[PDB]
RNA sequence: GUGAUGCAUGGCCGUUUUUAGUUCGUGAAUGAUUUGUCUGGUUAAUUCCGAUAACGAACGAGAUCUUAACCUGCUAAUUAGCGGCGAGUACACUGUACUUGCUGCUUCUUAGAGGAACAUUGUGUGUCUAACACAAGGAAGUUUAAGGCAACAACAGGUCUGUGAUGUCCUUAGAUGAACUAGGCUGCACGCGUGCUACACUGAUAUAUAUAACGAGUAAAAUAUGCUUGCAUACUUUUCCUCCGCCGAAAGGCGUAGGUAAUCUUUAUCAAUAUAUAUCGUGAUGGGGAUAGAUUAUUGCAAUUAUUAAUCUUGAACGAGGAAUGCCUAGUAAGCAUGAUUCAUCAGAUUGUGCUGACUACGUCCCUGCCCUUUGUACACA
């Protein structure tokens, strides 16, 4: 029935840790062909999870200076994301993602001691990591916008010392590690 | 031929200009309508175009500016609302009060709601100056006209 | 045959009158009209001084006229509404024939 | 025969008659096809799927959409369809088939049938934002 | 210059005297009145003058003055 | 800096991340071979 | 690609029916084969609009704009310059003053006009005070959209 | 003098006799400090 | 939200005139506010009816300390 | 008298202050005073429940109404809509896009009025009282939300430069009244704000469809005559938005349709973020526009201090941002424009309107700032 963007039907969805999909909350009511619905999130709580994934996505791409609030182009870049990972590799580009936002939050953070992170900020925490570092290289990294998310993706995803993400978590951890 | 716009703002600026013609003239009496004695005004009308709280209001200006006692005249200003009728009376005279510090009182009784669209629409209220030796005394006056039937009030037979 | 003002009462009730007063005559009436509202807004500052917080406060007058016709006689027609109309309201006339 | 229905969403009004016919369904002087966005032509298809192409192929329906942004248009063009294709039920084709006709546009959802009261709030003082004022300084 | 002339005066003597209410506007740079055809700008300094005679009165206002003649002024701008 | 051009899965960036060319270059050579952005065939 | 599976029964008995995006270039390319109008060569040195600031680098923008006009004229038969100009407005940056809408050449708009109407495709009349597109130009344009439908359908 | 009936010298409020802060709105032809104590009797009531 | 003392002694003071008229049905029990009532609001006469339903629902089952 | 005095005043306003506080009658407890006005629970709030030397009251809070919203097949159609047929322009086959005119009708374009939403119904939390949740119908369940009215008391807060509102003092022929020529607040080592345009490929660029609503709109030209292009006089209406057709790259100019306005702009529809395809594919780059002269036209008697304005040449910072520091919870942040005000001309100002409709709450007192209680004071201009 339904397809994303006329391509994907995402029929399969890993199971990551059960609490990762409610965040993301992909359904057949979430379902859409592009990015930036009409559905709200701030009437409640749990609405702001049930926004799709790949929504909090294109709506966290758009903060760079002027670029600000051009989700129109952000249903664009991550379009052409897409068409560009799923022949980058075989994976769909949708379960690649996932798995990449699985493994790309921080699970225990040390602010003020350390607090286990929340799936619903940790999921968010995820996706700022990965703009942070589609920023940073879309910051004089020669390369397009395109290639320097999906190459963050599939990086986050395949779980490399490249990324930005997992740079960050990293340093979370090692914080954690020298407080503890 | 002009425009309804700009005719009804004609008739509400001209309404501005009899209301202070009438407030400016009328300082001896009553209120005994408007025209759509007599003799000067009309002819000066057609010339240039060719219980009541503003009653208490000017009253009170009436009893002050001749040096009147203030305390007494103002009492007797209440008198008079409360024999008129009304639910209750606000008169305030704030300025010199024969000293050298600016001074206000107040005056209340009955309810004298103060807030409201409701409020608005019951409560009618005047404002007056009187000019006196050295100052300028600043008089306002309200009264709240007796209850279509007021929202809070409920009684039920 | 319109009307114009900016209470609703005055309009009601002479709009009332008039089309009782047709009914009363029996004749040619068209069927009343009902126009969306039109309305005057300003925005003014307060303080006449030029100190405290710029506060502002905004006006409001929203004017009603309406539509009617009737095939009856100019003079009588008239009449009868001069009879029975505020001098607040303004009217004027037009004749119908079928 | 004929029936002229409307749907109300948004800031778009759409206007749907549906008469007797073959299955001409007009979108002014275009169609349904033409409107650009395929994303919220198969959002009006929907229930072109949730009650049968068939049974619309002897229905014609005219509709005229003016005002508004797009999606509010594409709104209110699946607002005016439905009341109308239900109202023709109730009236003049079948009543047993609007029974279940009811009970799978609700199953779906209620957004179909009725429109939302969603609109711009009187933008406030203080400021450029609506809830935002200028910047201060001390 | 400016010189008043007397028929310059007489004229609005006269005028004056067969309504009894006039309004003389406070602007002095308008060239005609609506119910005169005179220069006004030699007749508001007259009417002020006359005021300060304390024949006529006047209730005064914005833009607009509002004379009202007396009892004691036609016996003595007559002749 | 740029240093890419047209002398030496058919879709703009796999062919552009094959042969370390630009985008623009990669794409005449898509149409070469096969003879904004769109849907894959 | 572009093509969708219909669900209705159309009529295509004119040029609404067709897309516009691809039928005004299938007419500018009918109308650089049979060579109906000029360039013209007079404006091949005038950026369209103010706000437009560059040149339109294809060579072939006066058929474009002939082709949009034509669609103009059908989608809506009581147009003129200002309704045209306001249709063709585009943003202008004034530099450090922030961007404001601003409407296109009138020259070329009335060229192009002028040009239909030579070809005899548009016309002129008090009554629908706008240009209005002629019987003869009526049934050619859909003669021409009903061939355009066959063959990008058959 | 050098008067004109163009710009801010042609007219002004009709009650202070002002220039400034004066609103041709609808052609009231009146200053800001006078119209926000005239609006009540005038008709301009403050709703919303 | 909580309630106002004069919706409240509203409340109080009606019921007990005519509390044989007034019966089970929440409807019934608005509309006879309605018609007893004298507040002018609608939306007054609509709080001040909910309220005396949710004094009715208290009786029968315990003291409502009053009528 | 825009001369001084807001520390002589009136009125208005801005703050304490959008919070929850303030007062009275009688009673009670050398005096200032206290209680009422509270231990506690709850909250939109002294809002209620309740305890109670207090009982009973008044203000403030509460409440009302416009906005989108559903219906009243209510009430109906002007300047609106629905049709039907009168002739069709091309297509199907046993109505279709575009036109002409009248009228079977008024949900639809709309407003007069009213209704509808009241913790509504049950499964729950609560001293079973006040209070709060879930789920459902419903457009409407945080008052459905956003708008306004803001008590008592106070500041020696601002304004006598808004007023022929105003006292006192001062001045008037070398005016402190008025007019006229020219000049200034537009200049700049710097600083701080209000704000405007960048650092791009989520973008620089050319095509076009799908676009809304608040809006807002009518004592002057020229012609002729006389004297000698200027003066006086007689004639129409030029003096708002403007459509159109022409001239001009444009700016702008010429002549007319229409409208004192749901009728003409424009409205079977006006902006931008779009859009889909295409040049470019992050190279201080083509981004970006600080930056000049040359000009052309309008507004105004007057544009020099390049008012405003299309054209070509001019080519800084800027690689996401110092010490510091501001604003903000849903059709709303932000981005994007745009209407209106002042306006002869001039938004980079203010106020409204709308589009795209986001990262994250059902909270906390850690800072800051308030409110209540207790407490200590040698403070009371606190």
């Known amino acids: ?180 | 031929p002009i425009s309804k716009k700009r005719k009804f703002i004609n008739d509400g600026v001209f309404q501005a200009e009899l209301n202070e013609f009438l407030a400016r003239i009328l300082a001896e009496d009553g209120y005994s309508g408007v025209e759509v004695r007599i003799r000067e005004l009309t002819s000066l009308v057609q010339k240039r175009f060719f219980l009541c709280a503003m009653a208490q209001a000017e009253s009170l200006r009436y009893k002050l500016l001749k040096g009147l006692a203030v305390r007494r005249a103002c009492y007797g200003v209440l008198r008079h609302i409360m024999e008129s009728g009304a639910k209750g009376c606000e008169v305030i005279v704030s300025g010199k009060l024969r000293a050298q510090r600016a001074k206000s009182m107040k005056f209340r009784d009955g309810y004298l709601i103060s807030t409201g669209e409701p409020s608005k629409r019951f409560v009618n209220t005047a404002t007056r100056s009187a000019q006196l030796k050295q100052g300028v005394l600043g008089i306002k006056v309200k009264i709240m006209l007796p209850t279509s039937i007021l929202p809070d009030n409920i009684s039920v037979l | 045959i319109a009307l114009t003002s900016k209470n609703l009462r005055a309009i009601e009730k002479v709009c009332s009158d008039i089309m009782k007063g047709a009914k009363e005559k029996n004749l040619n009436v068209s069927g009343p009209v009902r126009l969306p509202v039109k309305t005057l807004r300003i925005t003014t500052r307060k303080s006449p001084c030029g100190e405290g917080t710029n506060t502002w406060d905004r006006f409001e007058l929203r004017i009603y006229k309406r539509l009617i016709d009737l095939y009856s006689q100019c003079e009588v027609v008239t009449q009868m509404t001069s009879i029975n109309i505020d001098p607040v309201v303004e009217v004027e006339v037009i004749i119908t024939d079928s | 025969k004929r029936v002229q229905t409307f749907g109300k969403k948004k800031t778009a009004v759409a206007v749907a008659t549906v008469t007797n016919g073959k299955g001409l369904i007009k979108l002014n002087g275009k169609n349904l096809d033409l409107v650009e966005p395929y994303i919220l032509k198969t959002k009006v298809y929907e229930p072109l799927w949730l009650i049968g192409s068939g049974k619309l192929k002897n229905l014609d329906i005219r509709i005229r959409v003016k005002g508004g942004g797009q999606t509010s248009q594409i709104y209110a063009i699946r607002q005016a369809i439905g009341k109308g294709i239900i109202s023709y039920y109730q009236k003049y084709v079948d009543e047993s088939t609007k029974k279940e006709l009811k009970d799978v546009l609700l199953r779906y959802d209620r957004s179909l049938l009725v429109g939302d009261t969603r609109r711009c709030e009187p933008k406030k003082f203080g400021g450029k934002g609506a809830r935002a004022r200028y910047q201060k300084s001390y | 210059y400016s010189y008043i002339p007397k028929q310059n005066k007489k004229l609005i003597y006269e005028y004056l005297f067969k309504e009894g209410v006039i309004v003389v506007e406070k602007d002095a740079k308008i060239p005609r009145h609506p119910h005169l055809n005179v220069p006004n700008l030699h007749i508001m300094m007259t009417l002020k003058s006359l005021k300060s005679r304390n024949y006529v009165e006047e209730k005064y206002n914005w833009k607009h003055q509002y004379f009202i003649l007396n009892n004691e002024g036609i016996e003595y701008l007559r002749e | 800096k740029l240093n890419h051009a047209v002398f030496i899965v058919i879709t703009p960036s796999a062919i552009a991340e094959k042969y370390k060319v630009n985008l623009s270059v990669a794409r005449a050579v898509i149409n070469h071979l096969a003879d904004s952005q769109k849907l894959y065939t | 690609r572009l093509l969708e599976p219909v669900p209705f029964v159309k009529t295509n008995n004119c040029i609404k029916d067709v897309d516009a995006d691809l039928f005004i270039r299938s007419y500018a390319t009918h109308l650089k084969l049979h060579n109906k109008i000029t360039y013209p060569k007079w404006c091949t040195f005038v950026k369209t609009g103010k706000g437009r600031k560059l040149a339109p680098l294809n060579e072939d923008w006066y058929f474009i704009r002939a082709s949009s006009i034509l669609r103009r004229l059908y989608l809506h038969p009581d147009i003129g310059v200002g309704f045209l100009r306001r249709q063709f407005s585009s943003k202008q940056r004034r530099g450090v003053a922030p961007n404001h809408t601003s409407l296109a050449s009138g020259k070329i708009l009335r060229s192009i006009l002028q040009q239909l109407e030579n070809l005899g495709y548009v016309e002129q009349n008090p009554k629908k005070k706008g240009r209005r597109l002629t019987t003869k130009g009526e049934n050619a344009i859909n003669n021409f959209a009903r061939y355009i439908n066959k063959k990008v359908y058959n | 003098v050098h008067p004109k009936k163009y710009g801010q010298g042609s007219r002004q409020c009709r009650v202070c006799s002002n220039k400034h802060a004066i609103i041709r709105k609808y052609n009231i032809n009146i200053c800001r400090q006078c119209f926000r104590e005239r609006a009540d009797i005038i008709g301009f009531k403050k709703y919303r | 939200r909580v309630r106002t003392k004069t919706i409240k002694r509203a409340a109080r003071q009606i019921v007990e005139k005519y509390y044989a008229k007034l019966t089970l049905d929440f409807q019934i029990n608005k509309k006879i506010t309605e018609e007893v009532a004298i507040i002018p609001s609608k939306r007054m006469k609509n709080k001040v009816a909910g309220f005396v339903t949710h004094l009715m629902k208290r009786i029968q089952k315990g003291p409502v300390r009053g009528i």
């Open chain 1, 1 to 180: 029935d339904i397809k994303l963007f006329k391509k994907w039907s995402y029929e399969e969805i890993n199971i990551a840790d059960l609490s990762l999909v409610d965040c993301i909350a992909v359904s057949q009511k979430a379902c859409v062909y592009t990015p930036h619905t009409a559905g709200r999130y701030q009437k409640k709580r749990f609405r702001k999870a049930l926004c799709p994934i790949v929504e909090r996505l294109v709506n966290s791409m758009m903060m760079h200076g002027r670029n600000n609030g051009k989700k129109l182009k952000a249903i664009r870049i991550v379009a052409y994301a897409f068409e560009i990972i799923h022949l980058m590799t075989g994976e769909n580009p949708l379960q690649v993602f996932v798995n990449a936002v699985q493994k790309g939050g921080p699970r225990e953070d040390s602010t003020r001691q350390a607090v286990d992170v929340s799936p619903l900020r940790r999921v968010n925490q995820a996706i700022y990591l990965i703009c942070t570092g589609a920023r940073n290289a879309a910051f004089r990294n020669i390369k397009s916008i395109s290639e320097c998310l999906a190459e963050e993706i599939i990086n986050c995803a395949n779980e490399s010392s490249s990324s930005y993400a997992i740079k960050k978590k990293d340093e979370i951890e090692r914080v954690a590690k020298a407080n503890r």
